[PDB]
Design an enzyme around this catalytic site. Structure first.
Site, PDB file in Angstrom:
ATOM      1  N   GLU A 201       0.800  -1.213   0.000  1.00  0.00           N
ATOM      2  CA  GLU A 201       0.000   0.000   0.000  1.00  0.00           C
ATOM      3  C   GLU A 201       0.837   1.269   0.000  1.00  0.00           C
ATOM      4  OE1 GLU A 201      -0.023  -2.295   2.431  1.00  0.00           O
ATOM      5  OE2 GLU A 201      -2.098  -2.934   2.956  1.00  0.00           O
ATOM      6  N   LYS A 329     -15.463  -2.843  -2.510  1.00  0.00           N
ATOM      7  CA  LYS A 329     -14.388  -3.264  -3.397  1.00  0.00           C
ATOM      8  C   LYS A 329     -15.058  -3.837  -4.630  1.00  0.00           C
ATOM      9  CE  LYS A 329     -10.955  -4.384   0.331  1.00  0.00           C
ATOM     10  NZ  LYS A 329     -10.361  -5.380   1.296  1.00  0.00           N
TER      11      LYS A 329
END
Ligand SMILES: [Mg+2]
Ligand SMILES: [Mg+2]
EC number: 4.2.1.11
Lengths: 417, 421
Positions: A201, A329
């Site tokens: 990330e 998502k």
């Protein structure tokens, strides 16, 4: 009228070096849209080739083939603007609940590229095409900075420690606040001779001893960058508590769910935490009930593994009074139409929704447009390094600028600091 | 005829979390192109200079609102009305408007952003691939990449003297197979590091900086990674180095961590005998001209020798190096010189003298993929654009794969390393 004429698909690499696909939908006027499909590290089926001689079995040539040989005949001639119809056609062409025949990655690539082709045909911004005339809210981001749990080799039980730049007057100022805290943290870690390599990330996984040390370090970084915790920047957690839940014993590293709720409650009393994701395991329904009753009045409680962007699980969660926010998502469910239906079902019941990246992202920035299209007020799209994360922040800043006086940066967390 | 009508610029973040700009050039027909600019140097006498705001209240002084202002307030008037296709004319106008050799008044970042965005606007006007617009109908060579895997020196906190250890998938039949080869070695390397309890966080380029003790440990580790992935070193995959030797060169003592330039050349020659290294970048310091001649006399007939800090994409330095016979390949960083016209001319002038050219990323990259189009546009045969993670790197490989697929039977994957096999 403009209709689907052809669909192309090709194999690319995601940000972790593993294959995924990009899809280009082409109309009979020669207009087109292109989208790429992310991938996570229990959801709609991501279809892989399993050829051990190729990418250790992770190629997506079969999904590409399904786009080109199954979805093309199923969709050509249909209006580029009938998004719900196209998505229903693909769901039926596969015929299975989890999209396990054609691949949820094949279907999502088409779903997103189709919307973009329609938006490009109208020469309208995607967020306005998808969300209509009143799409105008820029989301308050939750920005990863420190990693633990399964995403590290440190002593942190929880998976992600994030900041939220809640006092920002604009998304672009939220981005700067995030970047400046990130820079202060990077320099603090260098000065402490702790590791500065970044994870998936784009944040850090230094060798810290505990959740509290990580929370303390973020507070130091916030103040060092010159901002005030709670007033300017709050904290958010992703515990990913399924990762340390023993299903046989019903314990979280030895602790009952009531103990675990007590642990989260004490952290929230002593830290400016305004959001907790997956604080209990995905099936620990008594734990979630106690967590919602204990903190659901004070803190945002996000289901990620609890909901998997799935309207059936969301509806069951809401009926039982669990959580107050839903992570979104799109590739966990596989079409835009079903993503929208998840958002709508949560939103009309008072839940916040948060568009989210995956650990395996691409240079595609659709989720920035989706967050604005649906006025979600929140997004989760990574730390302040690595362009598969930064590009979403860059896209949001372009959207805010394009909207001029119509833009509004507005946090949808009901319980902000 | 299609002319420049407006230019917009905005502030984005690069892959490091620091500001840069994207530029949009708009024609009077409403066609446009957009380009973003990677990180450069703000100071010094080596490169064209990017302009930073230096405002301590904002991004630690690294904002680029002044450069954005120059695009909109200085370059828009100088360029509007001119043909979108007159790339050379536009680049000359911007060079003049700035008036300095190193573009420090308006900023090399402002000028390159316009330069790239204009080329894109022109190609989009013609609806032609950028590499075909820039390089003509016979742009068709896909570059052999040099792929970062392990970092050292100033880019790490380990015991590696050299700065970058790379692989080249030289036996690939296609760029997309080169990408797969790199990714499979990257993945095997990651798993080796996991099993050895070594760190797997990545640096700027998307590779690893594990706690290794010596250059040889890193070279040995890459050999294990190659073999573990199922490939044969030397035959399928070769090695490449970036020593960045200026970083460990003592200018008063004229020593490389205690070694004369002759000793350091001997070290490199021994490394090249024992390992399948076919490329060395900045093997000696940028001004050690005696060191570099000796390096060229000893290895310049056997391995590729890259000047990066030796040349800094500057044609006058490249021309003087070639005249003195230093190096045999040139790193090309478009933002080190600041226009596309000067980039193409650096490549042309190097190429006709028998030097290979290698399009290169910067440590602060963006989601922009122009250097992929540039490597193909000029048929350079080589590119240096990072490891096999982080999309500011991967997106270039993805763009190269799109170009190759788009070209169909016209595509040729071909390494330009003169010591190719
Ligand atoms: Mg999660
Ligand atoms: Mg270099």
């Amino acid at each position: 009228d403009v209709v689907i004429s052809d669909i192309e698909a090709r194999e690319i690499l995601d940000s972790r070096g593993y294959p995924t696909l990009c899809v280009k939908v082409i109309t009979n006027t020669g207009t087109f849209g292109e989208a790429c499909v992310p991938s996570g590290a229990k959801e709609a089926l991501e279809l892989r080739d399993k050829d051990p001689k190729r990418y250790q079995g992770k190629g997506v040539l079969q999904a590409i083939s399904n786009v080109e040989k199954v979805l093309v005949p199923a969709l050509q001639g249909f209006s580029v603007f009938d998004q719900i119809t196209a998505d229903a056609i693909m769901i039926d062409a596969d015929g299975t609940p989890n999209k396990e025949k054609l691949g949820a990655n094949a279907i999502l690539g088409v779903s997103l590229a189709l919307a973009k082709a329609a938006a490009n045909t109208l020469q309208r911004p995607l967020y306005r095409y998808l969300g209509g005339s009143f799409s105008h809210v820029l989301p308050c981001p939750m920005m990863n900075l420190i990693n633990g749990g399964m995403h590290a080799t440190n002593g942190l039980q929880f998976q992600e420690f994030m900041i939220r730049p809640i006092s920002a007057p604009s998304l672009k100022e939220a981005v700067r606040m995030g970047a400046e805290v990130f820079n202060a943290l990077k320099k603090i870690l260098q000065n402490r001779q702790l590791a500065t390599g970044v994870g998936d990330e784009g944040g850090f996984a230094p060798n810290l001893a505990s959740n509290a040390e990580a929370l303390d370090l973020l507070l130091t970084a916030i103040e060092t960058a010159g901002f005030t915790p709670r007033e300017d920047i709050s904290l958010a957690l992703d515990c990913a508590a399924s990762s340390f839940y023993n299903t046989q014993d019903k314990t979280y590293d030895g602790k009952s769910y009531a103990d675990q709720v007590g642990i989260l409650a004490e952290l929230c009393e002593h830290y400016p935490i305004d959001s907790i994701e997956d604080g209990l395991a995905e099936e620990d329904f008594e734990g979630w009930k106690l967590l919602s009753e204990t903190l659901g009045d004070r803190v945002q409680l996000v289901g990620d593994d609890l909901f998997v962007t799935n309207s059936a699980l969301i509806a069951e969660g809401i009926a039982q009074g669990l959580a107050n926010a839903v992570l979104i998502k799109p590739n966990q469910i596989g079409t835009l139409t079903e993503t929208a239906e998840a958002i709508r079902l949560a939103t009309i019941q008072g839940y916040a929704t948060i568009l989210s990246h995956r650990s395996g992202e691409t240079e595609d920035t659709t989720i920035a447009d989706l967050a604005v299209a649906f006025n979600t007020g929140q997004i989760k799209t990574g730390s302040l390094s690595r362009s598969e994360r930064i590009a979403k922040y860059n896209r949001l800043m372009a959207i805010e600028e394009e909207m001029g006086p119509e833009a509004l940066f507005q946090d949808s967390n009901p319980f902000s600091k």
